[PDB]
Structure formats: C-alpha cells, structure tokens
Amino acid sequence: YNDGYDDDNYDYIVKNGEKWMDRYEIDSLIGKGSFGQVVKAYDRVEQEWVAIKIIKNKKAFLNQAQIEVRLLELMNKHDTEMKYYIVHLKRHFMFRNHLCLVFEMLSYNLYDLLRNTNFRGVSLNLTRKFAQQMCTALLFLATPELSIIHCDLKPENILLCNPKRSAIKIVDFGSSCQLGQRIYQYIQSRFYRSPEVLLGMPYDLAIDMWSLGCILVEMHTGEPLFSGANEVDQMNKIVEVLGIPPAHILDQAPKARKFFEKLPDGTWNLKKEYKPPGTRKLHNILGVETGGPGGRRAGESGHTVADYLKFKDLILRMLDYDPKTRIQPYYALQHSFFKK
Ligand SMILES: COc1ccc(-c2cc(N)nc(N)n2)cc1
User: Fold this and answer.
1) 148 - beta bridge partners?
2) Fewest CB atoms within 10 Å of the CB: 103, 205, 316, 336?
3) Rounded distance, CA 141 to CA 325, Å?
4) Owning domain of residue 6
C-alpha cells in the first residue's frame, strides 16, 4: 500500500517524530474516525501547534473532505465574530497521496470533560455558557448564504479552545451538507438523532437543535438523556420522556409503523420493558424541586428552582417533536435562561 506509507485501512501510518515538507513535525496521533486520522504537529514556519486531519487514501473520503474544505472556507469568508465558534481551517495540502487539513490546535472534547466529572456532570452555570455558544454557532450556520446542517452534533465533536476557559468550538463538518435536498438518510449519532430522522422523514437545520437539547441535559446530569441500543429502543426512550408524537407527524412519517400503531379512531400508540409514555418527566431527571440531578446541587449558586424551571423550559422547546415549531437559535438566545 502506497510505497509502504498506508495500512490496509488506507490510513497513513503515522510515525511520531516525522518531519513533513521541512515544515511540520508530527508529535502524535490524537484522533481517529471513518475519514482517517488527526495528529498534533508543530508548524516550524508559524511557530505554533496545529491539528492535521490526515484523510484516507480512498476517493470517497477524499471527495467528502473536499466538501468539508469548501464549507469551512465558505464559513471563514464571513465578516462576523460568530464564526469563532467554528474550528478554523488554516490551509490544506496533498501529501503522500493523503489530503491533509491543517486546523488550529484546540483542547479536550465535552466527552472528556464529562469523564473528568466521573459522569456526574458540570454546574448549571457552565452548562449555560456552553449553551449560549452552541446556539450562537447554530445561528451562524443557519445564515441563508450558509444553511449548513452539521448532522453529527454530540459531546465528542464539541472541543474546548483550552483546558482553562469555558470557550468552545464545533469540529468535523465531514458529515455536513447545505440545505436543499429534503430526503431521508441514516444520519446523526443514535443518542442525538432527531425524531424526523428516526421516522424516515426529510430533514432541515432543526436536527442540530434536537441534538443540542440532548447534549445540554447530558452536560448537567452526566449521562445521555436518550441512550438507545437501537432505533426502536431510541424512540421508546424519547416517548418515555416526551409522550406520543403528534398524529400530524406520524401520518406523514414513512417509518411511523416501525415504532407506532394507528388505532381505528385515527390516534396512534406504541407498538406491541418501558415506563408508560411521558412518565419520565424532564422535571424529575433535572431534579428541579430536589436539588438538581440526584440531589447533588443542593444549596449552590445559580441552582434555584426558578433557574431549573427556565432550563427545563428551554430544553423542552429544543426537544419539540415538530421541526416547524422547534425553537430556532435566535429565540433560544433570547430565552430567560440566559438572563443571569
Ligand atoms: C485538539 O485539536 C483538534 C482536534 C480535532 C480537530 C478536528 C477538526 C475537524 N474538522 N474534524 C475533526 N474530526 N477534528 C480539530 C482540532
């Protein structure tokens, strides 16, 4: 494979210490994915640490990373401070038959941050900082010129700028697309997958807002809100919390009958284990009246019952079954949860 530079996964065989075009010193492998690999590297010329995404030597992944480059460069054009919520692509190059995207060095992802809490979660105040940033990021992506659906929002794709501050950025637009297809694809990571995508329905930018609602509850509680072992398990766990989706959704939904039954009266219920629909209140998951998740926030700053009530309101508005009425980023940012 490739004058010996590639393994049988078409990945570049990374050597710690290697120097590239007399410029970059590869320090280590920090990241792996379907796309290929990510390495930490020192740019001798600019005197800075960088993350290089090394794409696989296969034409599908090369073509997809070309779409990623296009989108990142489109975003970088914009003369707004909102584009600083998206990881900066400095430049790209072909090297030993691999496309390489050079990024700014960021820090840990939000999954690492949860592992650092031993999966008991971060304060409501830190959740709020992350939420403001993520809603701004989504307000940016929903700019008409852009209309980018990220399509894979989850803790693992949201990184800290540095381990000392609360600043974050979204990475990995490899699964992204611009709005103007309205077709079904098996997309989003299962825990963060919108009901429209579960139901085989066409999707728009609202799916990133679904994923964000799920992420913010998990940041605070320490655990995924909806941890499905499969699509049926996933929908069933959503229905435990949010109850039966509206009939006007299910009537139009190609995969409605994978999870639901239409009854003779034209109402729907779960098909043929689980708590009855809507019995797992977000009110209780958040511990609104009981000192927050598992009572662990009992008498703490900015953990009042009213604070939890505003958070709950915002989350339930992000977890709307109906993509038409699901809160849009502008309005999310005007929510009283952010009046601190
Ligand atoms: C810590 O620095 C990093 C680590 C990873 C990335 C990154 C960017 C990107 N577009 N796609 C993926 N998969 N990863 C950027 C900076």
Assistant:
1) 178
2) 336
3) 19
4) 1-79+87-105
